């Protein structure tokens, strides 16, 4: 959480109306807001500075693992386990990553719904549009494989789709 990369997790610019009090009565929320800032915001903010100063004193780093692409199951010889094992572990990693892609595109669709309030049905067409594409791509990739899903079964499903898609194209002509 260095800071949610704004591109990945976007939020539209904030437009807040300025305080325009016409009435003469006092506004309690304004008073409580100041009391909260003094009583809560600052003594806490001081604590976080004391912790943060010591955190920067001892600074050590962790890195994000890099995995070289390796030949896919399409390049593996039949029953050659050492080739299939490399191909199979790689596919599992991507199957796992693609799941977190759908979640990200889901998190957007849920953030837009709340943010746009009562007008959400119009102001979230792009977010709904993106969510339907990722879902369709995911469905074709990984749906129906089963509990014992594998790269060989993912390939077989794809090869079945292409044949039916290929055949269909001919019938049009």
């Amino acid at each position: 959480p260095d800071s949610w990369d704004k591109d990945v997790y976007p939020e539209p610019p904030r437009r807040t109306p300025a305080p325009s009090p016409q009435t003469s009565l006092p506004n309690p929320i304004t008073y409580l807001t100041k009391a909260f800032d003094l009583l809560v915001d600052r003594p806490v903010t001081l604590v976080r500075e004391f912790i943060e100063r010591q955190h920067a004193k001892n600074k050590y780093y962790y890195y994000h693992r890099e995995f070289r692409r390796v030949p896919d199951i399409t390049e593996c010889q039949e029953k050659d386990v050492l080739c299939m094992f490399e191909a199979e572990m790689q596919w599992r990693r991507d199957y796992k990553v693609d799941q977190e892609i759908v979640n990200i595109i889901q998190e957007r669709l849920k953030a837009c719904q709340q943010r746009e309030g009562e007008s959400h049905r119009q102001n979230c067409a792009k977010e709904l549009e993106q969510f339907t594409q990722v879902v369709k791509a995911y469905q074709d990739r990984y749906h129906d494989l089963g509990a014992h899903y594998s790269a060989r079964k993912c390939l077989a499903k794809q090869k079945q789709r292409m044949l039916a898609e290929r055949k269909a194209a001919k019938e049009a002509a």
Binding site: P1, W4, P17, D41, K110, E116
Partner: protein, 63 residues
């Protein structure tokens, strides 16, 4: 007694929740998503100092 209650059972809990929400929950995407404020005609925007155009003139009903 109420002061002992308030400090232990209200003030201290709200520091923990504020430290937690401000420096752990808000530092992650979409954790707290708030409905965008209602913008009415003839309002002033804090960010841009913008002024929304006024509404058309009403049909001047008897009111």
């Amino acid at each position: 007694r109420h002061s002992i209650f308030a400090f232990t059972h209200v003030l201290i809990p709200v520091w923990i929740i504020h430290y937690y929400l401000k420096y752990h929950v808000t530092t992650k995407p979409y954790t707290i998503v708030e409905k965008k404020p209602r913008i009415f005609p003839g309002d002033t925007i804090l960010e841009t100092g913008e002024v929304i155009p006024p509404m058309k003139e009403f049909p001047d009903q008897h009111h």
